[PDB]
Amino acid sequence: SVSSSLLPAFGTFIEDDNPSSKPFIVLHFDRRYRLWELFLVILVGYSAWASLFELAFEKAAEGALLTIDLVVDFFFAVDIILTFFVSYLDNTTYLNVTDHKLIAKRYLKSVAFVMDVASTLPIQFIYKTITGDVGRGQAFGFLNLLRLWRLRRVAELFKRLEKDAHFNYFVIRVIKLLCVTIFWIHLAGCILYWIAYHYPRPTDTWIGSQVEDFKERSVWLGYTYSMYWSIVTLTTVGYGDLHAVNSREKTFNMFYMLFNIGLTSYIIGIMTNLVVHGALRTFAMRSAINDILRYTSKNRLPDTMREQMLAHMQLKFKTAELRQEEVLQDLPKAIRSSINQHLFRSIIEEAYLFKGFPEGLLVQLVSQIQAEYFPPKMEIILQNEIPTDFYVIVSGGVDIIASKGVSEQVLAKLGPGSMAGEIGVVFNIPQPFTVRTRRLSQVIRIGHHKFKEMVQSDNDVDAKMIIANFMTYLKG
Amino acid sequence: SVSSSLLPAFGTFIEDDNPSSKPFIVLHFDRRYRLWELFLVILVGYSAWASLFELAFEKAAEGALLTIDLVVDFFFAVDIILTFFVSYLDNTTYLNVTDHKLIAKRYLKSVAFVMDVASTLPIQFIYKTITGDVGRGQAFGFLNLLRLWRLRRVAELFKRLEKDAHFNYFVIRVIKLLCVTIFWIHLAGCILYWIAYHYPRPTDTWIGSQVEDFKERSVWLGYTYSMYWSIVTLTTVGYGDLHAVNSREKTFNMFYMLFNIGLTSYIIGIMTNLVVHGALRTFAMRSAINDILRYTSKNRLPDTMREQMLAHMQLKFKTAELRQEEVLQDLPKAIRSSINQHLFRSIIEEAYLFKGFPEGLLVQLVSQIQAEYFPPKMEIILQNEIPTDFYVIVSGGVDIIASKGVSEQVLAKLGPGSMAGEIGVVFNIPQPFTVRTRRLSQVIRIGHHKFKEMVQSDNDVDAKMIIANFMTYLKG
Amino acid sequence: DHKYRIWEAFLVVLVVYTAWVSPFEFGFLRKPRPPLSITDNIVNAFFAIDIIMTFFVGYLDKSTYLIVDDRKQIAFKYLRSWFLLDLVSTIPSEAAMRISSQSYGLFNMLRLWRLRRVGALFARLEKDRNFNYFWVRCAKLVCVTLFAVHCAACFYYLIAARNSNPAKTWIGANVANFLEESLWMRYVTSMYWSITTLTTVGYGDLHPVNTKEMIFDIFYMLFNLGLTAYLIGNMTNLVVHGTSRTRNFRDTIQAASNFAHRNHLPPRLQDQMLAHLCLKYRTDSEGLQQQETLDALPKAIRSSISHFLFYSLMDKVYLFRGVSNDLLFQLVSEMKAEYFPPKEDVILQNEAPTDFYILVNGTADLVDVDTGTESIVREVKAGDIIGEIGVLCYRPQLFTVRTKRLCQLLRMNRTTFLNIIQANVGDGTIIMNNLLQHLKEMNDPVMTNVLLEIEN
Amino acid sequence: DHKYRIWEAFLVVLVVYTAWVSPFEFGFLRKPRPPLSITDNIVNAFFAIDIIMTFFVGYLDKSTYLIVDDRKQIAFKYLRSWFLLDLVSTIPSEAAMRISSQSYGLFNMLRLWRLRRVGALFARLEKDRNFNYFWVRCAKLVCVTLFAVHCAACFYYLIAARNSNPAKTWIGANVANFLEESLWMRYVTSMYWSITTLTTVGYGDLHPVNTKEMIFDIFYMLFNLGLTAYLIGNMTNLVVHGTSRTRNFRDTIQAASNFAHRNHLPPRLQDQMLAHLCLKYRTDSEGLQQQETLDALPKAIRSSISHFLFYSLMDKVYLFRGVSNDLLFQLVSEMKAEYFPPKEDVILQNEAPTDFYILVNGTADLVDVDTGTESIVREVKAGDIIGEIGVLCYRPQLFTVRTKRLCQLLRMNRTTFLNIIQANVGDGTIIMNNLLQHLKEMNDPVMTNVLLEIEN
Ligand SMILES: [K+]
Ligand SMILES: [K+]
Ligand SMILES: [K+]
């Protein structure tokens, strides 16, 4: 109910369930609340570019950007009002708290509240209303770095997409390698241009020694040069087109080039892992094919003999696959019993020995049974051996054989519902026949030591009706 | 004796009575012959340098190099006369041929003879022995590339060093990365200068525009420049110091840069394989050890229990490693039989059940016995289960427990030479005791049906004397 | 011990100072100067005091004793290990200046012998568990790279300066007057060149001019070709061995979903399976999925662990009046702990009683699902047993249990209980008497107690 | 089928011709010229012939039937998939040029749609066994890289050439007059720049000047950052899958040496182990290589292996003269094969005989171990059986057999032979008579019957 709906990454539809609480409360896994955080994540992509772009390129702060920086901020203001009507899921008790008084105290005692209220205040707009219309000082403008707190939402979204199985894993872990590098390039370029702008001598800079007056020109002309330099310095191509001349920027260039080893040495460590781990199953199966095909050529065996060997191996991988699809091992008994009763109760009752049996023992006879799976044409019970157990057929055919050093078909085919090896276990005699499979089937094993005491433990024993049913079946 | 002696990389001493055929032959797995090949491999190092150095830097062909080039060729001329007295190992049979008329016919029918004769022939000295003083012609000098056929000796030597277990694998496959790169660099550096030398206009060449007269100068001053350019172009550092100016050398530069991705992408593919495949055991062991620590620390259990818990698992890895030391599985019967005779024959006889037993059947019985390994304080035979096996105690010790309530040590001081599980298998009765080990030990597994049929098949069977020994043991 | 650790960790701070000062003084200076000729004597004093205090030492070994005190025995080992080299790097340079004027340079590079103490600290600390393995490789690699860069820069500037004719050098061809500038302006250009060459971003200024620098650069450009390829293998190793859990989660969910779809289970029967499956990954450390990490141990260990967990709790129970030590011990060391998600049934109506439960933590409410009504008549806290009368009387369970919290319980089947009772019946007589002595109440169960006494 | 394959195999080289020609004509030319405008007509005629001849053959669907031949379905399959695109890119460029001269450049870039055919040859060749898996990735990577380089060079030169004021471009600043040189000289500089940039060796000449080339370069320098990192995974994934044999061999040899050293085997018994191991690991080309994993097959299939390898040889033997052949059907089916190194002993003197062997290849020597001498009186060739009389009379073995080549032997256990003789006693008289009457060399019947006739 609760853990079933938190698995998907985009919520679930809600219709008249018990955690409705007050009619003015919205749940935190609803679908309408999961199409509202995506909008904020999309708008986060615009509010990280603008702050850095306005840190350096002064006199661009007046224009349409002044209006957009308020139109965007209005929504992040509304979200703070909204966050008081949202339930949260407790950790000690997996019940989800849905009380207004309990959720109002959870938020006011967290640093997230103060950071959210700090990262939404208009600094430049308010300052010019009271003080002069233009703010300056070579320092006033570092408050534009407050709006870099809103990257936690993207970091959070990129954790709800990996856990889901409806989505790829080569496509989602490679789109997370574009944003990081593009942001890195943006930051480096803007910082370098800012360093160059505020210098005493304008003809002793990296741009002032090529273009005489980089100031009093267009903004985008200064933007293209400082993106070009950053993208050339990354990726380790170097022309002599543009380089550093001062001593304030040689140090920044050194520190920028020293940190770039660990990122280009990290992209490879992921693009190698993806390719290595995507190419194993084909390797194994092709190894099997190459191993088999080498035997059938050098010895010049006919075509049918090779064909049968190649057709027989395919079923073995299928048996392994179905053997690797079992997950109910260590769940509590109250669920294993229900699953077993739903899957296997019908066929146990229709057994020739298990007829007229007390209903008390059948309940715990249905439990602690583990299903099996076998490829066709394989031995399960041999001849002249100590009995150990017996099997019950479920969904396949089987054959019965009895010979010393050869094979002689006896009796006939056995469909679902039949037993196997029941004759020897009751008389404590070595098994008098041999049984081999015919097709891909599943069987249920019981055992002998358990069954020795299981029958004796009960108080409802009939007048050896076990013997009566056994003799009725054996007579034919 | 056939393949055992060829395993070491540097041969083996020869004492006497070997397949010598002493008159006029030397054995090809000898030790003194294996030190006459390393000498020629060392001499190949010098002869793969002067051959390329004389192609480009003409006027160096006259001097001491001319004398050394003949002194070295003397030995490679002697080797061809030597190689008629060597023995070879066949393929269809694994005998080594020691008849002259058979080894003589093999050599003349291959390309090795003609190629060796062609390579070991001086051609520069003779073709100006009387014709003229010195040779030229812009093509006479490509004849010097015939002496590059001697690299197969190094190629063969590096294959015999990786098959030995006395030598590393992280040091032999890393000295194989220096030689290839150094040879590649030398070849490119010589070819480029050769292209530069024979050009009409000397001022339109890569070196001619930096030094006005690169000719009429020392050869070493023209060698350093062309080595520096090659090492700069490789490793992908590029200054604008020296570049191409013509159209005859832009093309060579293009191909040289295209053929280098496959090598700089191949060094990484080996240095990332050595590191990965050298660090697995520590990872697994650390996973187990830190798996233990996290659970015990959080549950606040004292250090006393964790001291034993940590030490217990250490023996598990030792048992697994000792299990992995077994390799003889598919060898013919005549080898496993003899090994079992040397290892297991004495202890089988000294058993109370097996005393006076016919020796003709002990040989059949002392074979096909596969042992096992058990960590300390384990269980092998429980109480009240169907009989399948009995055991034999080679080493270690086991204890018998039979009290469900207040379990204790009674009637249990079993040591090397005792037996367990005898009573249950011999009486066809469910096992009446449980036996537990004490330390790391090795035991023998026999079976039930096989031991039943073995005595029945024989005619001269000890009749009830086995029963006599059994009653003597069981009475007390 | 404790007093020795503090003093031992002190000298590892001065080794960095020595390793930074010595190449700089070798390359950029010629004669001693006051600001840097003061701390050197202090460092020599500290190291000399370390030298004299090395004979009152004890060492540990697998074969040798933990503490060995025979003083004359230690001397034969110590004097034959590093006694000759540990003394040469302590004489003040001013004392040795009178030997030769040109020897001031080569005498300042012998202090790098004290750098061994960092090599005996990055291997001693390797074999420890309280510190992560992620932060024992990066520090070493970073230190190696920084040392290489610094040394190369200093040597290159020395080669440039020692030559005559200041023009026609890698620095004089770019700066008109490079010998008339501050010592901290010549030190930035050299490191600029060194980091430009090591990362293979060749700009084009500050390149060699004559043959000696060409040879030096040829030898310096081959070391990096290996130093760079030895840094990608480690990163790939680290990345591949750090992203295992999430793929396990995805694979397990995929397998469970595929199996459930294959057998066409009813829609309501997958929710319990999924909730239980995810609850183990939530409590990955509390013992549900950790059981096999705990179930690989012998009998004694896992029999003694339950002592610290449930022994005291099992004493104060409804039943088990006064059994001294044995029945309680055997019953305690046979249970099986299980976690249950909130709001899940554990006992239904008339469903073939097989076992009973003991509740350790959490809360639950006894529920009587009658015809059309669901009562909350009883509520149980930690300690009480659920499902007892239905297993000692072979009668179907009276009520149902639904939890309201993440609860941890205990289990034991009837067959083991009966076998234990049959093994020792004398202590068994107390249990049935306890039930009759405790069914003395004025509420409704008296009507069924009459039936019990009819069948008891 | 033979005729069909050749035609499409012919129609893949023309695709390469188009993929080279079309971008070059787009970039470096503006008006048709004879030498490069004639083969276009030929290739267009060939592709038109291909287009018209597509309804004379039927598609094949495996699931629907073994083979499908139809009329209506082919029309719908061809019409609704790629008919329009294939039809439109066939009109001669001369015909449509009269619409406008500017269309002649952009029109020729539509012929790249025919590049899907290479996408088929690299999908049909992947699922095959006659071609390795290593020569199907390198070619793809090489082709992709070369195509990228060529396209980038052509587009960059086009951007350069379309400009006015021929100076202030990436090429005008380097050569004063670039429009007055040969057409094959302007095509080398562009490729020089392209491969200089793609391999990240930036020399410094031929760099962008104005903003359009800066933007193009910014966009071109990001694609390589992924294309280069994609080529190292495919090389590590190749190096790892190529060095598995040698490591296994070294591990096995080391393990065997550890075993022998731990149990202290005698020097003359380790040689047989280290000889058989080497023989097995160098006999991996044929024989007992797959039989380690060929034992997982059912008995029905494995029973047919012996029929085509030993049944014909089993017919003509010393024994088994005349039989119903029912016995042989099981005797051959219960046989095992082994290999022996040259100069190895298989049978010693008087050591409780248990088996008898059949010789298939090679030679063997029968040697009597007399008092101090070893004679070579009897030599056996392939075909005969050794040890028959000693195992059918409960007598110790007569002589010792030593091999002299690389042999191959068949083995049967005496217990199974006794079991099969007991199962069919009637046919045993034939075997007994065959043993009795065939002793036909000097001294042989009497030495065999020294006690047999007494005990017969
Ligand atoms: K580079
Ligand atoms: K570069
Ligand atoms: K450059």
Residue numbers in the entry:
A (entry chain C), B (entry chain A): 54 to 529
C (entry chain D), D (entry chain B): 54 to 509
Please quote the paper that reports this structure.
The electrophysiological results show that AtKC1 inhibits the channel activity of WT AKT1, the constitutively-active mutant Asp379Ala, and the phosphor-mimetics. Within expectation, the structure of AKT1-AtKC1 displays a 2-fold symmetric assembly at CPD. The overall structure of AKT1-AtKC1 is quite similar to WT AKT1, with root-mean-square deviations of 2.78 Å for 1753 aligned Cα atoms. The inner gate of the hetero-channel is also in closed state. Markedly, the C-linkers of AtKC1 resemble the “straight” C-linkers of AKT1 Mol I/I’, while the C-linkers of AKT1 exhibit the canonical “kinked” conformation as Mol II/II’. The “straight” C-linkers of AtKC1 may restrict the movement of adjacent C-linkers of AKT1. This structural observation mechanistically explains how AtKC1 exerted its inhibitory effect on AKT1. Different from WT AKT1, no extra densities that resemble loop1/1’ of AKT1 have been observed near the “straight” C-linker of AtKC1. This indicates the C-linkers of AtKC1 preferentially adopt a “straight” conformation, without the help of loop1/1’-like elements.
